[PDB]
Amino acid sequence: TPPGLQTDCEALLSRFQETDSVRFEDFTELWRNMKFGTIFCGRMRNLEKNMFTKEALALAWRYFLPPYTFQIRVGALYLLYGLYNTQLCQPKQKIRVALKDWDEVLKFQQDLVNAQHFDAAYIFRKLRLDRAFHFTAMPKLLSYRM
Amino acid sequence: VSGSGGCNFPEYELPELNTRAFHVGAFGELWRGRLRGAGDLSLREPAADSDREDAAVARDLDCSLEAAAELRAVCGLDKLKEVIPENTDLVTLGVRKRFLEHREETITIDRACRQETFVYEMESHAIGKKPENSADMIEEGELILSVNILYPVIFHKHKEHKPYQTMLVLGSQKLTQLRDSIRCVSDLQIGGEFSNTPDQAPEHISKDLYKSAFFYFEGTFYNDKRYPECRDLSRTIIEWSESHDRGYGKFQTARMEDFTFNDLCIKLGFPYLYCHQGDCEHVIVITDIRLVHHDDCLDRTLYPLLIKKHWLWTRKCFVCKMYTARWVTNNDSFAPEDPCFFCDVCFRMLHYDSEGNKLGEFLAYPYVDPGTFN
Amino acid sequence: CVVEENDPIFERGSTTTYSSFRKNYYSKPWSNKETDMFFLAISMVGTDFSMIGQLFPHRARIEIKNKFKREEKTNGWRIDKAFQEKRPFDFDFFAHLLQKVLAEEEKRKQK
Amino acid sequence: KLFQASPSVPAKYVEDKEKMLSRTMQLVELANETWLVTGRHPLPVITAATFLAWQSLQPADRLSCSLARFCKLANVDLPYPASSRLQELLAVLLRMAEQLAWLRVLRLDKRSVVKHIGDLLQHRQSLVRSAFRDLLLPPCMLKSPKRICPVPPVSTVTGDENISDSEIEQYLRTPQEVRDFQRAQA
Amino acid sequence: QPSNVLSMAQLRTLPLADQIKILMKNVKVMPFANLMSLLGPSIDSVAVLRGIQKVAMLVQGNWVVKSDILYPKDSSSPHSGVPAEVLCRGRD
Amino acid sequence: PYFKDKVTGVGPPANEDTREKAAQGIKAFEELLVTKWKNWEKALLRKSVVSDRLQRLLQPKLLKLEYLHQKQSKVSSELERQALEKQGREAEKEIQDINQLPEEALLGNRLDSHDWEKISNINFEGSRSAEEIRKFWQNSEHPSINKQEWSREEEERLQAIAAAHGHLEWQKIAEELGTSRSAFQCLQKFQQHNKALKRKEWTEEEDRMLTQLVQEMRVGSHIPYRRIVYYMEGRDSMQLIYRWTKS
């Protein structure tokens, strides 16, 4: 896992924990004050930057699991959204997903439908239309040679 | 024989090691069923635009632009941070600056990234390539499986293990294609003694002679029956496994030209076998199962292009140390060592006189260096 | 019926077997403080092993007899001094010392 | 069962019967002539000898095999003193190696003398002769027995007929101790 | 559910290599056309050639089984008991 | 990692294809591997050779002494007992002189008869092949080899001696050099000092062949210059790099 990016994501989630629930006003305030889209290209080897963004998105989606309040979950999901929409890497790295995670997000969409946390279904639907999710069995790659 | 009864979801069995048994064809079928797809075409956009999205939201749950009109403006690039990443309280930027300093110390310009550029080019080789024929277009939702292979012993048993190539395979395609695509050195290897006749062209290579090959996945033996010269080592394997109550249950036998990747029952992260040429065994590790995408290779003809290829060091001629060896000599007096190695010119000028007569007694064989594919 | 209650043993090679001659005894050694309090109990009681075994619950009377024979065979002056000295029989303080020895062996096992 | 290749035991452990039996016979004769079987159980020595023979017939593949491993492979109850007998026989073999010329220069040990055990039995006569020139007894007796069987001081002091009655009185149990014993054994 | 223990059906049920090996060990003299006719027309001529070149030699246009195929390394002469290597050398 | 999925390694059966591979002679890269030699391995080789030589020299003497002892124990004559004792003392003095001989002559000449397979399977536990041990003892483990590096007075002579010999023979080159070294080391140093044969100069056909290589087997920007050299004998790495990298 990416060490520094893990700490950055945890700090952003801690800030979203004190922000409003799902209100996009606080997400804009965060993007303004701290700019969680901190670094994408800088100046580094092409494949190094590529794997940097890859591990970023992978760890973010892995952290995006079911248990957390409506703050942490939304924060992780829309951190992923922003990282994908501000993709400065030439390839648009797809967000790594799990098989049952699709049914999980479908149940989340159903909850949004039978709820009124507005703009959340909107951002998630835009992300889906953007063709960003690529699903697998494990949030990372695994072997037996380690 | 039917597949092992199990849920399509790959429920875990060992922490961060591997999941339980499951089917592949039903996996892909349920994967395509639980969503609509119709997005692997790259037709987002290259005028009336508001009414179309209005009608779209009208079928959606909100049927209003109140939130969309604000969120589409918020989620833009004109309000996004080229510039030096500094002057802000950060955490990873410290590690970034430390890496920049370590680079400026010894790393010179932008290079020495051999494996990095290898991965880059091997991934770009499959970006938006179209098939030659219109009938070769990969349909949406096709299963793509990533499969690492560990054939060889010649590598770093110390470096966490990075022995050999990784392949991508399509579900609907047959396993015989993967069999024929695995680039094994033993297939190019050639047997026979050619000390007296060095100029004789080696004929009937091991690939053509030893056509015996078979896969082994979860106690299922897939034996190739495409050629009339293929034997059945699974026969002796089953004989051994059944001659004594060693705890191994009955194993099923099937053909390789009738079972595809879909009909297999595998465990992601579990080692399976691919044994050919008698003792040439490959440890097969199917790691990931994913669907096709417009960014991936959409041409069914060249899918098994590897996503990874391990570098291998060629054996240099022991005499001149300038050319790669092509002949291996045993019991050679003129040779400095017993497991010796010579190239064409050195072997000719050392082991033969001005007319070509065999100087001295020795045993020479065509040394097919492992670094022949790359 | 035995519902997989026991496991088969792959023992007793039909070829042959040998003897052991040593089965059960497997005594346990003493310590310095234990030898001291044992000499104290000797001085306090005498040579009657019944009372010594009754007051020693955690050590066997056969082991006590073996220890007394070993002392008689090796250290005679110590037995002579023990029989010279005498102490009235104490019960409550002896039980307190027994509890202390239990705590000491517990600490030993912990170490 | 190291004679016929069975399913469990691979072919590497299988060895010849006649040669291994002859080697074991030579080894146990050496043990009997070097005072190793006298006073001790013979079967542990036989086991150690056959194990050494099985290891010497092919030291390469069997340098890592242990006594317990060999017993498990052969399905034989491991004797307890077999290990001590093996350690003593290997010490005798090291002495024979020191007696020999090339081996004492090689400076072998209890792990590398197994490959030359065979050579030690070729001329073991003169080797054992010289070893005895330069008796096998238990380790508890070869620890420099300076004072062998110390002479105890003769004490035949008998007095006239007795000593006194103070000892009788100190042997007699007091009423307090009698009552204490009665209370204890009540 | 002699070397001719296997019948024609049991032979055909074996791989082409084993079929050719057994046919050569049994007959020791047979033309390539006769071998093809016995094996069947559905088998490839190149395959039959590759199978026979490893267990037979060409003598005056005909195919003769190799000596080692008839006399394994652990076998011996049934009349004199000499090793199989000498028999192979003599047959060669 | 492990590479024994199917057959754990307890009862792996040698099948028909396996025995055919073993009997044909297709030794791809497994047994031809070579491992660097170690100092303790050198010491073990020297000790084993010395011990084998001393044992083969003493075994006849030991058998003769045993025969003399048997004659003593079986012959009851006193007149011949003096001669028997004299011969026994003579054999003892012979053994004493053999043991007193310094440890310089008991190693043997460069080409002497020994039991390489025996020494290997006894001492090296089969890790080192008999032929490899023979070569290592014949050209790399002899006290008569000149360990001193070339004093810039051997290459100029060898470039002519080997040229006259046409590289057709092994021992004659070293014998004509006469510096008490091995032909292996001599040829190695000579070919490391000299340059390639320099096939040709800017041939358009070879340039287009290299271009086809860079188009068929190249990945990204890195170029396998060793793959380039393999299909083109008579070149050198540094010059080929500096030349092909430009123009």
- Residue B41: Cβ within 10 Å count: 11
- Which of F233, F220, F79 has its CA nearest to residue B326? F233
Alpha-carbon distance D147 to nearest alpha carbon in chain F (angstroms): 41
One-character DSSP codes across B236-281: HHHHHHHHS-SS----EEEETTT-BSTT-EE-TT-EEEEEETTTEE
CB within 8 Å: A94 and B117: no
For residue B283, which phi and psi values (nearest 5 degrees)? -85, 115
**Contacts for B124 with CB less than 8 Å, ≥ 6 apart:** none
Q: What angle do CA A117, A123, A124 make, to 5 degrees?
A: 90
Chosen from D102, D116, D127 to mutate, greatest number of chain F CBs within 10 A = D102
| SS3 label, residue A29 | helix
Chosen from F48, F55, F72 to mutate, greatest number of chain D CBs within 10 A = F55
Which chain F residue lies closest to D100 (C-alpha atoms)? F55
CB within 8 Å: A35 and B70: no
One-character DSSP codes across E52-84: HTTTEEEETTEEEE-HHHHS-TT-B-TTT--BH
Residues of B within 8 A of F196 (CB-CB) are 322
Q: Do chains F and B touch (3 or more CB pairs under 8 A)?
A: yes
Alpha-carbon distance C80 to nearest alpha carbon in chain D (angstroms): 12
- Which residues on neighbouring strands pair with residue B74, listed in sequence order? none
- Which of C42, C58, C41, C44 has its CA nearest to residue C108? C58
CB within 8 Å: C15 and D185: no
Q: Do chains D and E touch (3 or more CB pairs under 8 A)?
A: no
Q: Does D177 touch chain C (CB under 8 A)?
A: yes
Q: Give the containing element (helix H, strand E) for C67.
A: helix C61-74
Resolution, Å (one decimal): 3.0
SS (H, E, C) C4-54: CCCCCCCCCCCCCCCCCCCCCCCCCCCCHHHHHHHHHHHHHHCCCHHHHHH
Q: Which among D75, D170, D177 has CB closest to C89?
A: D177
For residue B139, which phi and psi values (nearest 5 degrees)? -70, 155
Q: Which among B186, B321, B349 has CB closest to F167?
A: B349
Report which DSSP code applies to B166: E
Those of residues 47-66 in B touching chain F at CB distance below 8 A are none
| SS3 label, residue E31 | coil
Residues of F within 8 A of D102 (CB-CB) are 50-51, 54-55, 58
- Which chains does chain E touch, 3 or more C-beta pairs < 8 A? B
Chosen from B223, B225, B229 to mutate, greatest number of chain E CBs within 10 A = B229
Q: Does D104 touch chain F (CB under 8 A)?
A: no
Residues of F within 8 A of B374 (CB-CB) are 217, 224, 227
Judge whether A145 and A108 are in contact, CB under 8 Å. Answer: no
Report which DSSP code applies to D153: P
| SS3 label, residue B289 | strand
Which chain B residue lies closest to A86 (C-alpha atoms)? B77
CB within 8 Å: E15 and B229: yes
Q: Give the containing element (helix H, strand E) for E11.
A: helix E8-12
| SS3 label, residue B197 | coil
Q: Give the containing element (helix H, strand E) for B284.
A: strand B280-291
Judge whether D63 and D111 are in contact, CB under 8 Å. Answer: yes
Distance between CA atoms of F195 and F235, rounded to whole angstroms?
9
Judge whether B316 and B335 are in contact, CB under 8 Å. Answer: no
If interface means Cβ-Cβ distance under 8 Å, which residues of chain E face chain B? 15-18, 43-44, 47, 50-51
Token pair in block for residue B108: 């010179």
| SS3 label, residue D48 | helix
Residues of E within 8 A of B229 (CB-CB) are 15-17, 47, 50-51
Instruction: Report chain E's terminal Cα–Cα distance, integer Å.
Output: 45
Do strands B280-291 and B143-150 pair parallel, antiparallel, or not at all (unpaired)? Answer: antiparallel
Residues of B within 8 A of F31 (CB-CB) are 339
Q: Do chains E and A touch (3 or more CB pairs under 8 A)?
A: no
Residues of B within 8 A of A55 (CB-CB) are none
Those of residues 135-174 in B touching chain F at CB distance below 8 A are 150, 153-154, 157, 161, 163
Distance between CA atoms of D23 and D17, rounded to whole angstroms?
10
Question: Taken in order E70, E75, E79, E83, is the CA torsion positive or negative?
Answer: positive
Q: Which among E15, E43, E44 has CB closest to B231?
A: E15
Q: Which residue has the tokens 């008490």?
A: F180
Judge whether D96 and D124 are in contact, CB under 8 Å. Answer: yes
Judge whether D101 and D10 are in contact, CB under 8 Å. Answer: no
Q: Which residue has the tokens 């490893």?
A: E54
Instruction: Please give the single-letter amino acid code of residue D124.
Output: R
Judge whether B281 and B164 are in contact, CB under 8 Å. Answer: no
CB within 8 Å: A38 and B90: yes
Which chain F residue lies closest to B194 (C-alpha atoms)? F25
Residues of A within 8 A of B69 (CB-CB) are none
Question: Taken in order B347, B352, B354, B357, is the CA torsion positive or negative?
Answer: negative
CB within 8 Å: F58 and D119: no
Do strands B340-342 and B220-223 pair parallel, antiparallel, or not at all (unpaired)? Answer: unpaired
Distance between CA atoms of D184 and C92, rounded to whole angstroms?
12
| SS3 label, residue F143 | coil
Distance between CA atoms of F163 and B282, rounded to whole angstroms?
48
**Contacts for B289 with CB less than 8 Å, ≥ 6 apart:** A136, A137, B24, B27, B28, B143, B144, B145, B146, B268
Residues of C within 8 A of D181 (CB-CB) are 45, 51, 89
Token pair in block for residue F233: 């004998």
CB within 8 Å: E50 and B230: no
Judge whether A100 and B8 are in contact, CB under 8 Å. Answer: no
Q: Does D101 touch chain F (CB under 8 A)?
A: yes
**To the nearest 10°, the Cα dihedral for B53, B56, B57, B63?**
110
Q: Does D167 touch chain C (CB under 8 A)?
A: no
Instruction: Please give the single-letter amino acid code of residue D107.
Output: R
Q: Does B331 touch chain F (CB under 8 A)?
A: yes
Residues of E within 8 A of B203 (CB-CB) are none
Q: Does D118 touch chain F (CB under 8 A)?
A: no
**Contacts for D182 with CB less than 8 Å, ≥ 6 apart:** none
One-character DSSP codes across A41-63: -SS--HHHHHHHHHHHHHHHHHH
Q: How many residue pairs from chains C and D have C-beta atoms closer than 8 A?
A: 30
For residue F222, which phi and psi values (nearest 5 degrees)? -65, 140
Distance between CA atoms of A141 and B289, rounded to whole angstroms?
11
For residue D50, which phi and psi values (nearest 5 degrees)? -65, -35
Distances (CA, A) of D40 to C20, D26, F215: 14, 18, 82
Distance between CA atoms of F74 and F69, rounded to whole angstroms?
9
**To the nearest 10°, the Cα dihedral for D75, D79, D85, D86?**
30
Judge whether F182 and B347 are in contact, CB under 8 Å. Answer: no
Tell me which long-range contacts F189-198 makes (C-beta under 8 A, separation of at least 24): F189/F150, F189/F154, F189/F155, F190/F154, F190/F155, F190/F158, F190/F159, F190/F162, F191/B319, F191/B320, F191/B321, F191/B322, F192/B321, F193/F155, F194/F155, F194/F159, F195/F236, F196/B322, F196/F234, F196/F235, F196/F236, F197/F234, F198/F234
CB within 8 Å: F122 and D106: no
Chosen from F4, F15, F138, F214 to mutate, greatest number of chain B CBs within 10 A = F15
CB within 8 Å: B295 and A135: no
Instruction: Please give the single-letter amino acid code of residue B241.
Output: S
Q: Which among A38, A137, A146 has CB closest to B10?
A: A137
**Contacts for B27 with CB less than 8 Å, ≥ 6 apart:** B8, B143, B289
Residues of D within 8 A of F59 (CB-CB) are 122
Token pair in block for residue F108: 């043997």
Q: Which among B74, B90, B270 has CB closest to A24?
A: B74
CB within 8 Å: B278 and F26: no
Q: How many residue pairs from chains B and E have C-beta atoms closer than 8 A?
A: 19
